[PDB]
Amino acid sequence: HTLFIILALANANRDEFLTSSQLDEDRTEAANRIICTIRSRRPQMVRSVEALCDAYIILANLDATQWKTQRKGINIPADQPITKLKNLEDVVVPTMEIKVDHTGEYGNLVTIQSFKAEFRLAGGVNLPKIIDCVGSDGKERRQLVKGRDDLRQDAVMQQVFQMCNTLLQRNTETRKRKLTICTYKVVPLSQRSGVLEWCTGTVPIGEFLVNNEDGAHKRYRPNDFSAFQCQKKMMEVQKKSFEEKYEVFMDVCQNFQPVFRYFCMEKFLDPAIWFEKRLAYTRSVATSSIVGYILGLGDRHVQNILINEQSAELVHIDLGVAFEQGKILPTPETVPFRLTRDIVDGMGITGVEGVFRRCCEKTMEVMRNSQETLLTIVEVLLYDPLFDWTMNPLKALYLAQRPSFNKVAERVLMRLQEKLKGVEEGTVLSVGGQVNLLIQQAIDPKNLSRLFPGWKAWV
Amino acid sequence: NKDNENLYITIKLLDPFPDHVVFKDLRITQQKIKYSRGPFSLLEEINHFLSVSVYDALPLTRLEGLKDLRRQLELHKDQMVDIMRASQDNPQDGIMVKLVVNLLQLSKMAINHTGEKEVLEAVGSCLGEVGPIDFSTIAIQHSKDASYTKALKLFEDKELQWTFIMLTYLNNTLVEDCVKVRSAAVTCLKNILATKTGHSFWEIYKMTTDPMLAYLQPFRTSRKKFLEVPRFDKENPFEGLDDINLWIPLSENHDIWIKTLTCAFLDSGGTKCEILQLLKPMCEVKTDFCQTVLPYLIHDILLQDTNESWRNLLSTHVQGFFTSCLRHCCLDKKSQRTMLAVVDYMRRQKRPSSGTIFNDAFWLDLNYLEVAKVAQSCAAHFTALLYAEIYADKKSMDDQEKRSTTISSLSEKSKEETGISLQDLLLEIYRSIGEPDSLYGCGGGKMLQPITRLRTYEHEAMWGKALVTYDLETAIPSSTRQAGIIQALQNLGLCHILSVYLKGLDYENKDWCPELEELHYQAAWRNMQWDHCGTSYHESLYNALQSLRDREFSTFYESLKYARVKEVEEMCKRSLESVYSLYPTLSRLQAIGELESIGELFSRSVTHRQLSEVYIKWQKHSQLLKDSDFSFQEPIMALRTVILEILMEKEMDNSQRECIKDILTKHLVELSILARTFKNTQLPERAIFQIKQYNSVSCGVSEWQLEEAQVFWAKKEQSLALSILKQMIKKLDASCAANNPSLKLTYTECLRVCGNWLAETCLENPAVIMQTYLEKAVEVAGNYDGESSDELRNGKMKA
Amino acid sequence: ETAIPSSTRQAGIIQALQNLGLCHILSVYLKGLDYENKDWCPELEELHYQAAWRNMQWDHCGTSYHESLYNALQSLRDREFSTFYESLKYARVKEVEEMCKRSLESVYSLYPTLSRLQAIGELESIGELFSRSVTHRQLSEVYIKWQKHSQLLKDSDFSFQEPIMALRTVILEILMEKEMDNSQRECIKDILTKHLVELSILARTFKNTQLPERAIFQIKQYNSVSCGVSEWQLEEAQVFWAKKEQSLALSILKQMIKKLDASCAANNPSLKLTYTECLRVCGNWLAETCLENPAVIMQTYLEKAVEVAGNYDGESSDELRNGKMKA
Ligand SMILES: Nc1ncnc2c1ncn2[C@@H]1O[C@H](COP(=O)(O)OP(=O)(O)NP(=O)(O)O)[C@@H](O)[C@H]1O
Ligand SMILES: [Mg+2]
Ligand SMILES: [Zn+2]
């Protein structure tokens, strides 16, 4: 659980080696000392893992821009050292979650055996490579390798989700409802490249709903406006008055009816199973929305949310924007979370009323009851020198593109503290009152109109 | 034949022989042939028990296995915690909940069979060992044959799947006592296997391994010319089915209705598939086959339907049948379930025209609101919920198309068109499901009527509000008016008030309905009113307790046996679809089991070791119910308090009754803690009073006194709680001198609690709180050197 | 607790039950005690007579206070005026007698007797109205006199005001159950409805929720639901709001507003005050609960109430002036 941690710090500048401030060299030198101490007693494990780490960095640095139009799988070039390495009995799979035991002896752990010769690609501004890792048991595991991006922020957000999951488990009110947050392992390897878990059996909500070829909206409502038509209209009214934006949004919403409720109907024909999956979906959305609001999660567009096909549970990815840094964007995020018409429509005929509202209240009570715990954890994160959670113009322009640190951290902590005590506009609000305000703000059509078209508020 | 390798596997899975001298030699052989690999844990015993069920469907043969399963559950309660700790990740396929469902299914098979009483008692005893443990699931799932599901995947053609299902049913029905059924079946096998489709089925299905292939070898024959099914062209194929009387005879004769309806479909010339026409002789001898084949026949007709003539005819006849159900006529539950299966089967079929699942749900032009009500009437809660959502979606699409509305608005149109309110319908569907959060989804319908308000108060444990509403409103029927009142009074304590209130009702009324027997007996045994003296649950419990006092053990076990059997029979006849329906039965069975366990201890001599083991067993099973609702745990705790008090009122000339007094005091403290967790204040106050009846105030303080301070703190009485603890601390300082290890934990906890309470109330400066309460608690637990304990380690951590 | 003496044990139980409503429960509980015990002590006799007249248990039939009150009410029922005044005279003379023998040093000691003497006086005052013909003018003057004396008790404790209001409800309801072939009983029904609304408001001020719910139920016995809404229905929404049931209160008022919009067309001056207040209350409740955006709350509830109160031009009134100020 720590050998990959230290190497990532020690391999901060190994990206250009294979192809600043005094704190950087001091951290790098100290990390090297730990590695030598680690290698003193177990040299075979250290040498084996660093070879695997180097292979990931070399694989990440591969350009591979020619196969952008290919979606069938590209054979890995023989020059990559990842193909040479096989049967690493001393390396445990970084993608898998390793249970922590009190004893110092680790046994019967799944180790890396080999890697498949075929790798896939995923859409985006960059081209990440999807590789398959074969464990000791012979079960294949899918890993996502990302280049030209920082993965340490995602790893930090994953732990907070674990703390939120751990807090929810120990309370009887939320443990009965099985209120949990979907998490995926993130293993940073350097300051520029990294590897993270690929959620098998999951599809983006945008891909399922507004796909050009076989989208849910097109299949169920052919006579309604197409996804391209709605996107084009919103961009036209972008440089217009607020009133013009509102009437455009209402016009688009009139000719765009949600069809997300059909996801459970076409995948779970059994009424008993269908009810369980719909209930799990409603609980997952309610739990994630409250936690995301508490942590100030932003940029929750269609491509940043994944839904499990087997379990119908939402998975949140791309957690770089948090702590209400989304309101600092040129187009502010006026919604605490995503509660669009598609999200509400998939909850059943009752909508937000019922399971969603009660689960949100139960989650808020747990958050309020663990305020001292939650505030302390965030305080540790906010003072991390390597945690670049603050917003910069380069990140702000990249997020929305079209064709004193101490004072900020204290303000964020104060804003988090007032949220956990229910203070919203200088007044004390109960758990039920705070939940109602959050639900109302998210579903308010006026707030959705001001939002960026890329967020797809109408979706 | 123990050494036989091919017979080795099956001899291991057979049910153990009954415990008798005649079955001695076979018993050691079976115990050794099964335990040859090694000892089996509790999980392995459960897995072994479930595997035997799928072999033979006779509950009598499983009587010994039920007793064996009871023994493992009783003496291995520690491993049930680990089993549940392994199943919260995937609670849908939880091993424990599958056992509960399997036992209940076995009980259903035992209904209307010889020797049904002992098998139900064994299941109830097995269901008494495991209580209403929170299974983290809502929908009950039934075990399905993996091989049967796998075999369906091999065939891609829909007709081939029809062939396999029929032959599998035909192969299954070759072993009953009836000879006409056997003769009719074998003729069908000869006819089906001689056709081209049957010939094509064998080639695909011969690759896999299945005993049915060997059974069907004699019937199959090789012929140059394939069997030809004659096709007749009726002048008007629709005249046979266009009869409202034929679709709804409903003369309390379901057997002839399904047979005539199936036969009419066969005689119609619409059917195209050849295998179906050959099923007529078998349909005429079995009603179950007619129900099974009917969805396939209806599906077959609509495939070659032209100009939507068959679709329109079937849509209006099926809808007419459903409308007849909404009347008040008086249709049998079997007929409605058969039509529901037809609707459910058609919903899973892809229409010939390209479309989605929503289009596939409308093979026939049907009003799903009526079907949902029928499904709710047939206790198909999840099926009704899905149908209601489909009905609402269809009308919303229809309204949008017509124009080219909230749940309250849509219900208004539904009432004025078909007489059924959609939002009202959704109410009992969610109540039948029993999920607490879904009740708030559809509550806007019927807000102001007291009945709807009363359930909300009872669900939220607002007993004071419910009690006022019950007294105020008079239009509510009297039978349920007091039923709430006694129920509300009991949850608030008020035992003396309830006793007088019950006496007042009996004075003013001579006619006495049975559901007031149930509550009066419930109050009589709870209040130890022993002078009050088919049989009901609380009647059996009250009778058994009096039998326990009078040492009448012969009737004490008989009354418990009758109660245990009676609980299962009422459990068998319900829907068995919602997990929340299992909890009230499991809790009552657990209470019966605990009383039965005490009977052997009561009958023989009383000793400290036996009582300590019972309390350890009680606490071991109690923590297994930590996630259970208070409504399912309170009756169990109430019985435990009573039976412990029954032991104390017994004569003890041995002067050892202090052991029972300590156990009762510890149990009542735990009851106060459990009630405090569930935001209840009346019950903890009553438990404290009961403790003070048997306990006094001495120099050495006790734990229940500290509990009283916590109870008063929960009652928002901070001055009372602080005064109790300050006096308690003052006595502790003067009494103990670092000499009593038992008082060390109480003194350390008391100082810590008082310091925390003072800090929260801001009634003392930080300097005094640390100097007098906080650091002293750390000091007391630290320098007393009373180490080598686990409770101290927990106490030191908190300090 | 059981170590407490029995004589005061049921005395507290009956008194606690009465303050929480539970009239049917108390009646059955009283019947149960009489069944299990034959000895009948005066202090239990005092409470049983108090419950009998409060619950109109007229079939139960020196003299004490509640005994005289119960006897006088039956005398009022039977038109036996000779004994009705004599019983009230004996009660009035008796009540002063205990006050004479006390210390007379604490002002708080005088309050229970003054409240009891006020109740006796009100019953005596209405006796002359009962004996002669019933007219609208006499009934209005009595209610105005009751209201004028009630505001003089605005600083009194609820324990000294509740018995007075309880007798007024009993007196008014006794008038309704009298035979009236003149078809003018609607005047008493309106007076009782107004009195019960005031009782609900007074009980709500003293942080009491059981009594306002009982008063609402009593109103619904003599009233129904029509196109034109009334004030007691608005009072029910306020009562449910005090019971920490926000969804129930909002649903009542939203249904009430929808009915008002369809029913009135700026034609009924009486419904103008109800419509303006109801929109204002619902908007304030929605704002506090944060269940609606500010734009809709102002557009639908707040500014609408101002528009209704102002643009309807139903001026020249004092209640409407108070309504506009609140709006
Ligand atoms: N952990 C994951 N599990 C499964 N699929 C993932 C995961 N992360 C990303 N994806 C997929 O990759 C697609 C692109 O997202 P991502 O890999 O984050 O690149 P991106 O859109 O460029 N994010 P960013 O680099 O911060 O701008 C998503 O739409 C998902 O389908
Ligand atoms: Mg993204
Ligand atoms: Zn009928």
Residue numbers in the entry:
A (entry chain B): 2555 to 2573, 2591 to 2974, 3001 to 3056
B (entry chain B): 1549 to 1876, 1899 to 1974, 1984 to 2112, 2121 to 2386
C (entry chain A): 2052 to 2112, 2121 to 2386
Reported in the publication:
ATM belongs to the phosphatidylinositol-3 kinase–related kinase (PIKK) superfamily, whose members share a common domain architecture. ATM is directly activated by oxidative stress in vitro and in cells. Overall, ATM emerges as a key cellular sensor of oxidative stress, initiating a signaling cascade to respond to and alleviate deleterious oxidative damage.
Most of the dimers present in the cryo-EM sample have a basal state conformation. The dimer consensus map has been low-pass-filtered to 7 Å in the same manner as the H2O2-activated state map, and no additional bridge density is present. Basal ATM forms a dimer through two key interfaces in the C-terminal half of the protein. Under basal conditions, ATM basal state is proposed to be in equilibrium with a rotated, PRD-displaced conformation, with the equilibrium greatly favoring the basal state.
